[PDB]
RNA sequence: UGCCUGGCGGCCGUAGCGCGGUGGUCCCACCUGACCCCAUGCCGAACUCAGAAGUGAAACGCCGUAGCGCCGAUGGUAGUGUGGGGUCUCCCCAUGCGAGAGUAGGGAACUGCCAGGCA
RNA sequence: CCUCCUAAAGAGUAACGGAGGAGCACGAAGGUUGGCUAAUCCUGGUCGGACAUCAGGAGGUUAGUGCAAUGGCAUAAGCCAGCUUGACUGCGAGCGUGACGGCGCGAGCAGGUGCGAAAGCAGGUCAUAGUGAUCCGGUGGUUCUGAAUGGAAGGGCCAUC
RNA sequence: ACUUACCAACCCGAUGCAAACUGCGAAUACCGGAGAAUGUUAUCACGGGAGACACACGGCGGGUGCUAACGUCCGUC
């Protein structure tokens, strides 16, 4: 019934994959909820956007007793 | 604490030999008696809510919390977080003194009284009951009444079965069924 | 007529009919009717083929329907241009793969099973064959 | 449950100090005794540990756990910490209130000269 | 619309003001907030919420 | 060094649940008392104080048990990149990678620092 | 303008394709500190039934989140109380996303505060919609300009309608 | 206080289906790093001048249409 609307697709997804050396302040994954969680040297933004807090490589880990995914940054 | 001393002297040694426990701490014991009053009618008029508070605080000896409602549904005509009842939980010295005043003056002066029900257990060893026509309570005067009110006397017991809950009241002598 | 009583959404895309079937063995009765070809079974075809066998296998035994349509097909009516949104739902179809057991029957002789399944194979738009329950 | 409600209460304060990489001072309270441990930021090893179940502390105490005992063992951990020099540890209340022996163990260690 | 605009005026000598919105229909009470005045470089009393 | 117990972790169900048995010198748990420090959106239940009369019940720790959760091959099947072909709505052939589910089976965790008790 | 799918396991991706929703609300529904754990069902029972409120047990987030939908949420972002105003100002490395105009995230520093004992946290709200570029003026502040000079008018700057 | 040739929720076992179901899970594609070979820099930045913004069909992955169209709208070649 009277359909036919669609919004601008927000540019989500992973912007910095694992093994990439990023700068301090770079955006790794743009996301709505906590699909990915903050870990070592990774800050969580206001809109749950995970960013870098230190210069290093992106490391994906699955830790915790609830089997949740994490993003950590090891020193290069 | 007349029945608290009566508990340690008579009730503990009675259940020690009846159900042959290996530890003396395996005895059933009372934890709390939650004096409740679900007034309910306070959607229309709020003056019966304040009167219910003072009547439940006359049966007990301390101030209650006006209880907020559980979950807002439309078919039951209640709102989320709505003041609709009041309760008092008694633990310690207030618990033993009220339990004596319950069984010897309030319970026998019930008209048409034949006995409580010996099967009014929850399934794990706790007993809930009510007593009718609250004039039987000596605190409420007959001139200060507004309407018949409510009360849910529940005996919280650390026992693991209903049979252990039966024998604990037997030492409190619970007049009979 | 076999159709869903309630769906979360009214319309559904066209899709494809690729892949192999999963309804391989008879697990309710002893006799079955297995599809050989590939295609779609509409709501009228499933209803008519149930009526086609039931006439000859009179009221004893038991018949199962192993499939369910769960897929609507819309049509655009005559003298209507293309566009103007998707058309209205007309009939329900079922995606059928080669190897799907469609029709089952139990409590009948084997000779009676050969007759009724032959009478129901003509109403189906795809080729079928006769199968029998194998254990394990 | 009694114990598991204490664990989930502290868990927000536990993992917050893990995100900062600081050394935390956890406490365990008992009607009998009381515990206090200085833990490395990895969490798998400790550096300063002194309790009231040790006979060195319980001799000077009338009862094993009270506000006087938490002042004794609060100093005792803090005196062993200054001999090691961990010097600005963090304080983990570990699910208890900051009102009683948890406060008494903390204020005694503040008096010795630790930075928290 | 229904939502009106107000200006939080500093109680000090400076005439610096912030802006915000309040509901005049159900909340006629004057707002009381402490905000940073960048002229006097302190936190001061803000008043006059219409 | 062994045994037992506590604390914080690594790990995140081969670490869970249920059933059966067992532990109190120490430990922990309940328990005792509470005018008070305080606490309750009522309530010494929780919170928290002061004590040790009592006890291994509830809970917790350990051992045992395959009812359940979970882990999980080998082979095979579905699918697919590239190329080729057919009866071209679909499928096959050459080569590369390999499921899901299910079966055999595994499985009643393992490990680090430190403290206490016993020998 | 927002949400999901179409979208073919990165992003992007059309149609008079399929389903909705927004032109706000909020001084607490914000910040911080301290606490708290539902949905459903069994049994028990002065008024009391289908529900008024409870007790224990089963169950362990299927509940809830100012609303559309998805992705989140137990350390709870859910709920309650105390104290409050960081819904701070001047800045901002670095980054996402755009043809462009622009939009969005962002630690940290300087100044002065709120809460907590403290480590710390706070530049709005679980996130993603709640919006109108410019010209033209209105209001407040700032000697910046002042068509001979000294003012003033007007304009600009900043705040705002 | 019980039951009958009655209707029947939840739960349990067996069995399917779903672009807007996922307790599971590829092929390749994509992102980053290292390495050899090969390719007239094929790449990026910047400057001068454009044209083009009506695309077609075929294979494949689809929406729509009748798994009609030398039909239409995308992705890819
Ligand atoms: Mg206690
Ligand atoms: Mg036991
Ligand atoms: Mg497998």
UniProtKB/Swiss-Prot annotation, chain A:
Domain of life, per lineage: Bacteria
Protein name (Swiss-Prot/TrEMBL): Large ribosomal subunit protein bL27
Subunit structure as annotated in this protein's UniProt entry: Part of the 50S ribosomal subunit. Cross-links to the 23S rRNA. Cross-links to the A and P site tRNAs.
BP term (GO), one: regulation of cell growth
Family designation: Belongs to the bacterial ribosomal protein bL27 family.
NCBIfam families in the record: L27
InterPro entries: Ribosomal_bL27, Ribosomal_bL27_CS
Cellular-component GO terms for this entry: cytoplasm; cytosolic large ribosomal subunit
Keywords of the record: Ribonucleoprotein, Ribosomal protein, RNA-binding, rRNA-binding, tRNA-binding
A single GO molecular function term of this UniProt record: ribosome binding
Organism: Escherichia coli (strain K12)
Gene3D superfamilies tied to this protein: 2.40.50.100
Any Pfam family: Ribosomal_L27
UniProtKB/Swiss-Prot annotation, chain B:
GO BP: cytoplasmic translation; ribosomal large subunit assembly; translation
PROSITE patterns named in the record: RIBOSOMAL_L5 (PS00358)
GO MF terms held by the record: 5S rRNA binding; RNA binding; structural constituent of ribosome; tRNA binding
N6-acetyllysine, modified sites: 2
InterPro entries: Ribosomal_uL5 (IPR002132), Ribosomal_uL5_bac-type (IPR020930), Ribosomal_uL5_C (IPR031309), Ribosomal_uL5_CS (IPR020929), Ribosomal_uL5_dom_sf (IPR022803), Ribosomal_uL5_N (IPR031310)
Ribosomal protein found in the keyword field: yes
SUPFAM superfamilies linked: RL5-like
Cysteines engaged in disulfide bonds, as pairs: none
Gene Ontology cellular component terms for the protein in this record: cytoplasm; cytosol; cytosolic large ribosomal subunit
Listed Gene3D superfamilies: 3.30.1440.10
Family matches, as Pfam families: Ribosomal_L5, Ribosomal_L5_C
Record key words, sorted: Acetylation, Ribonucleoprotein, Ribosomal protein, RNA-binding, rRNA-binding, tRNA-binding
Membrane-spanning intervals of the chain: none
Family according to the record: Belongs to the universal ribosomal protein uL5 family.
Oligomer status and interactors: Part of the 50S ribosomal subunit; part of the 5S rRNA/L5/L18/L25 subcomplex. Contacts the 5S rRNA; cross-links to the P site tRNA. Forms a bridge to the 30S subunit in the 70S ribosome, contacting protein S13 and S19.
Other comment: Identified as a multicopy suppressor of the slow growth phenotype of an rsgA (yjeQ) deletion mutant.
Listed PANTHER family: 60S RIBOSOMAL PROTEIN L11-RELATED (PTHR11994)
Protein name, per record: Large ribosomal subunit protein uL5
Protein species of origin: Escherichia coli (strain K12)
Swiss-Prot record, chain C:
Modification after translation: Is hydroxylated on Arg-81 by RoxA. The modification is nearly suppressed when E.coli is grown in anoxia.
Molecular function GO terms recorded: rRNA binding; structural constituent of ribosome; tRNA binding
BP term (GO), one: cytoplasmic translation
GO cellular component: cytoplasm; cytosolic large ribosomal subunit
Coiled-coil regions listed in the entry: none
Modified residues ((3R)-3-hydroxyarginine): 81
Pfam family for this entry, one: Ribosomal_L16
Organism taxonomic ancestry: Bacteria, Pseudomonadati, Pseudomonadota, Gammaproteobacteria, Enterobacterales
InterPro entries, sorted: Ribosomal_uL16 (IPR047873), Ribosomal_uL16_bact-type (IPR000114), Ribosomal_uL16_CS (IPR020798), Ribosomal_uL16_dom (IPR016180), Ribosomal_uL16_sf (IPR036920)
Modification N-methylmethionine, positions: 1
Gene this protein is translated from: rplP
Protein's name according to its UniProt entry: Large ribosomal subunit protein uL16
Subunit structure comment from the entry: Part of the 50S ribosomal subunit. Cross-links to the A and P site tRNAs. Interacts with assembly factor DarP(YjgA).
UniProt similarity note: Belongs to the universal ribosomal protein uL16 family.
Alphabetized UniProt keyword annotations: Hydroxylation, Methylation, Ribonucleoprotein, Ribosomal protein, RNA-binding, rRNA-binding, tRNA-binding
Species for this entry: Escherichia coli (strain K12)
Swiss-Prot record, chain D:
Gene Ontology biological process terms in this record: cytoplasmic translation
Changes after translation: The protein has been shown to contain a phosphoserine, which was required for the protein to bind to 5S rRNA. However, the presence of this phosphoserine is controversial, and it has not been seen by mass spectrometry.
Bilayer-crossing regions: none
CDD domains: Ribosomal_L18_L5e
GO MF annotations, alphabetized: 5S rRNA binding; structural constituent of ribosome
Keywords of the record: Phosphoprotein, Ribonucleoprotein, Ribosomal protein, RNA-binding, rRNA-binding
Known function: This is one of the proteins that mediates the attachment of the 5S rRNA subcomplex onto the large ribosomal subunit where it forms part of the central protuberance. Binds stably to 5S rRNA; increases binding abilities of L5 in a cooperative fashion; both proteins together confer 23S rRNA binding. The 5S rRNA and some of its associated proteins might help stabilize positioning of ribosome-bound tRNAs.
Name of protein: Large ribosomal subunit protein uL18
Name of encoding gene: rplR
